[PDB]
Amino acid sequence: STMMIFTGNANPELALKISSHLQIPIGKATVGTFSDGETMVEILENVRGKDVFVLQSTCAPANNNLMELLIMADALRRSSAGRITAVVPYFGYARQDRRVRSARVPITAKVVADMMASVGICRVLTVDLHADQIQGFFYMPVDNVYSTPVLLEDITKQKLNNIMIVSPDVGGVVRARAVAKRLNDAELSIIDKRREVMHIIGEPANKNCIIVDDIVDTAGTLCTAAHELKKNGAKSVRAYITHPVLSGPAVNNIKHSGLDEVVVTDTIPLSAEAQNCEKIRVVSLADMLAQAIKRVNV
Amino acid sequence: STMMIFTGNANPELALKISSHLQIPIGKATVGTFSDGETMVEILENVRGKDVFVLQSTCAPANNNLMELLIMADALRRSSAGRITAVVPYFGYARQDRRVRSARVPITAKVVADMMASVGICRVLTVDLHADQIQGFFYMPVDNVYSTPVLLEDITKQKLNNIMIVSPDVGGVVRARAVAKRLNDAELSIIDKRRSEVMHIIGEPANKNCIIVDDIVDTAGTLCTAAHELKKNGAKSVRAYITHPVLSGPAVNNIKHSGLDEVVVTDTIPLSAEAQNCEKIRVVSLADMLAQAIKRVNV
Numbered sequence: 105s106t107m108m109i110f111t112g113n114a115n116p117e118l119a120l121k122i123s124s125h126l127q128i129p130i131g132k133a134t135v136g137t138f139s140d141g142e143t144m145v146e147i148l149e150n151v152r153g154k155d156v157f158v159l160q161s162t163c164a165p166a167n168n169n170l171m172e173l174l175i176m177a178d179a180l181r182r183s184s185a186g187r188i189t190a191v192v193p194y195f196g197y198a199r200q201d202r203r204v205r206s207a208r209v210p211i212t213a214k215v216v217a218d219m220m221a222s223v224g225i226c227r228v229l230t231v232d233l234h235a236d237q238i239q240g241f242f243y244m245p246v247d248n249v250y251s252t253p254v255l256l257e258d259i260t261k262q263k264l265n266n267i268m269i270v271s272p273d274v275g276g277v278v279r280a281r282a283v284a285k286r287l288n289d290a291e292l293s294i295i296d297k298r299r300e301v302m303h304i305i306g307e308p309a310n311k312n313c314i315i316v317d318d319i320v321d322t323a324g325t326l327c328t329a330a331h332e333l334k335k336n337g338a339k340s341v342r343a344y345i346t347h348p349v350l351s352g353p354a355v356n357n358i359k360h361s362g363l364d365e366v367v368v369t370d371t372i373p374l375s376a377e378a379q380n381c382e383k384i385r386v387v388s389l390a391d392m393l394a395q396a397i398k399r400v401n402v
Numbered sequence: 403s404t405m406m407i408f409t410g411n412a413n414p415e416l417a418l419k420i421s422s423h424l425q426i427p428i429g430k431a432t433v434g435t436f437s438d439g440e441t442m443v444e445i446l447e448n449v450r451g452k453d454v455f456v457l458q459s460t461c462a463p464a465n466n467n468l469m470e471l472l473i474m475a476d477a478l479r480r481s482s483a484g485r486i487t488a489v490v491p492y493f494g495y496a497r498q499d500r501r502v503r504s505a506r507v508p509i510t511a512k513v514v515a516d517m518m519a520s521v522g523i524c525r526v527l528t529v530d531l532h533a534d535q536i537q538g539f540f541y542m543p544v545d546n547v548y549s550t551p552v553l554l555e556d557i558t559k560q561k562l563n564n565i566m567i568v569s570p571d572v573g574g575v576v577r578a579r580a581v582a583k584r585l586n587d588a589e590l591s592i593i594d595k596r597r598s599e600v601m602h603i604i605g606e607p608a609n610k611n612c613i614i615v616d617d618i619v620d621t622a623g624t625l626c627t628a629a630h631e632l633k634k635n636g637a638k639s640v641r642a643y644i645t646h647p648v649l650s651g652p653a654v655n656n657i658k659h660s661g662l663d664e665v666v667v668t669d670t671i672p673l674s675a676e677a678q679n680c681e682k683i684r685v686v687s688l689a690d691m692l693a694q695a696i697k698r699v700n701v
């Protein structure tokens with residue numbers, strides 16, 4: 105009623121699905137570039153006093169997708185939108201969230217958080233934030249929704265027994281345990297790479313192994329984890345990973361790996377090449393995100 | 403002694419020329435991308451207490467070049483640089499500097515100014531800012547240096563008579579007059595288009611060697627339509643001096659097929675290979691001017 109939704113160019117397919125679940129159309133807006141490539145925005149709706157949600161992951165191309173979101177917010181703010189919420193299902197730059205050992209590097213996730221505050225965004229809604237502590241980078245509320253229910257429901261459809269959940273690094277154990285907890289408290293193993301050489305903490309022999317992670321980027325560790333699980337007698341290996349970044353050699357890595365299937369969500373659209381990769385399959389968070397948007401709408 | 407310079411990927415050739423004039427090396431820093439395209443920066447020098455200058459036009463790719471500048475500044479700031487100056491010879495997004503008739507548009511130039519303040523930049527140095535009033539978008543000092551001395555020196559080398567300076571639109575008259583006044587107080591004409599778009603000239607260019615002056619050549623529509631109108635109205639020759647060679651889309655081919663004798667541009671923005679192959683386009687360098695401006699603010 106007060107709710108309006110706009111989208112940039114980052115993931116128009118997900119925006120269309122969210123709109124279908126909300127039963128409200130996508131608001132009209134020019135979001136593109138000038139001839140020279142500068143980001144170009146004009147809002148083509150009256151937004152005064154409206155509860156406005158901008159649907160825009162900051163996936164590749166990250167800086168262009170971020171600038172679209174930021175200057176959409178700037179345009180909406182000076183046009184007197186009542187509230188501006190950034191729905192950023194995949195939050196780019198989240199891995200740059202500290203200076204490891206005080207290295208002379210930026211904290212780009214904090215730069216981005218401050219950018220969003222600077223243009224008058226009032227809330228962030230995001231999925232499986234790489235570090236939930238990124239909530240504290242913001243004064244504004246940050247709703248970090250977990251993809252676990254949708255990934256769990258798809259795992260259930262596979263009708264597997266002897267399930268073992270595998271964390272592919274020591275940083276992903278919390279997310280991996282959250283899946284294992286809901287599968288009759290399934291077994292959990294952790295991949296521990298040293299020096300060069302990977303070690304499995306746990307016993308994968310004759311197990312249907314399911315690697316769980318938040319991001320698949322180059323898929324290098326995902327595929328080396330799958331090879332080592334199979335070399336140690338896994339009955340099968342699949343992966344459930346929220347955000348399909350899939351940069352560089354990722355699709356070829358997956359194609360030539362021992363993974364049965366890699367299931368990802370639609371926080372990031374797949375390239376044409378990834379859409380043609382028979383091992384990759386998408387499950388949707390559009391319903392979950394629509395429900396989250398309805399919960400905050402006022 | 404206290405000065406350090408770094409550069410991103412926007413215009414390394416200009417950065418290296420400035421470095422050569424200052425006789426100080428470019429500081430070591432990784433400026434690139436992670437595999438997924440996210441901007442990646444690591445400063446590879448001790449910068450503590452140093453007077454640091456980051457050389458980075460925000461020309462195309464504008465958002466990537468801007469992000470490099472911003473997170474270079476963020477890295478330098480957390481590394482305790484003494485001062486951080488953004489040397490941005492071409493300031494991208496300067497044309498989005500108001501909401502025309504309160505349209506529902508961003509003021510992106512102000513978004514960008516606030517971005518620079520937010521990462522701890524202490525000063526901006528820029529060339530021929532599209533609107534000098536953008537200085538007031540900032541709390542920090544903004545030094546807007548004019549390219550005029552370099553363009554005047556080059557015009558003088560041509561040894562032309564019957565010179566007429568031409569503003570190719572009504573917003574360029576202040577810049578064009580500043581050149582005309584300093585060029586032996588030359589005559590001035592103005593191109594005035596009306597969507598009837600029909601061209602009209604204010605002034606008399608017949609039999610004159612006309613020199614179009616402007617800040618940006620982007621698609622070259624303004625430039626080429628002005629050059630055609632001047633030739634149609636009897637100009638003896640037409641050339642152009644335009645600071646920033648954005649040169650998007652069909653710009654180079656438009657210039658190639660125009661009647662322009664020459665288009666002189668600066669090196670605030672690197673030329674594409676196609677522009678480099680266009681005999682009509684010639685570059686004059688602002689490396690010395692920018693080096694001197696950097697020396698002037700160095701503490």
Ligand SMILES: Nc1ncnc2c1ncn2[C@@H]1O[C@H](COP(=O)(O)OP(=O)(O)O)[C@@H](O)[C@H]1O
Pocket residue numbers: 197198199200201204275321436437438440
């Ligand atoms: N887009 C990116 N792609 C790959 N690595 C990144 C990216 N952004 C930051 N990083 C790097 O990832 C590292 C931190 O990642 P994170 O998952 O938070 O912890 P860990 O290093 O334990 O995996 C840092 O070295 C950081 O520079």
Ligand SMILES: Nc1ncnc2c1ncn2[C@@H]1O[C@H](COP(=O)(O)OP(=O)(O)O)[C@@H](O)[C@H]1O
Pocket residue numbers: 138139140142495496497498502573
């Ligand atoms: N990168 C760009 N390329 C082309 N036009 C732009 C760009 N950025 C902003 N603009 C548009 O140019 C117009 C303002 O330009 P300016 O030269 O200041 O005044 P004028 O409208 O008289 O040309 C605005 O409509 C703005 O939307």
Ligand SMILES: Nc1ncnc2c1ncn2[C@@H]1O[C@H](COP(=O)(O)O)[C@@H](O)[C@H]1O
Pocket residue numbers: 204205
């Ligand atoms: N003593 C420590 N306590 C907690 N985290 C650490 C420690 N040492 C390194 N790390 C983190 O571990 C990662 C790198 O591991 P390493 O190979 O041990 O340097 C980086 O994310 C560091 O921030």
Ligand SMILES: Nc1ncnc2c1ncn2[C@@H]1O[C@H](COP(=O)(O)O)[C@@H](O)[C@H]1O
Pocket residue numbers: 236250251252278279282
């Ligand atoms: N899917 C998930 N991703 C990341 N963290 C989670 C997830 N599920 C639970 N947690 C965290 O795990 C901890 C234990 O909470 P719980 O397991 O829900 O009792 C809390 O800090 C949660 O935030």
Ligand SMILES: O=P(O)(O)OC[C@H]1O[C@H](O)[C@H](O)[C@@H]1O
Pocket residue numbers: 199273276317318319320321322323324325326
């Ligand atoms: O091996 P890649 O797919 O390139 O990187 C993916 C990892 O990058 C981040 O740490 C995520 O948490 C994943 O574990």
Ligand SMILES: O=P(O)(O)OC[C@H]1O[C@H](O)[C@H](O)[C@@H]1O
Pocket residue numbers: 571574616617618619620621622623624625
């Ligand atoms: O005609 P284009 O080359 O695309 O645009 C360049 C013009 O755009 C701006 O007004 C500048 O001041 C120039 O006059």
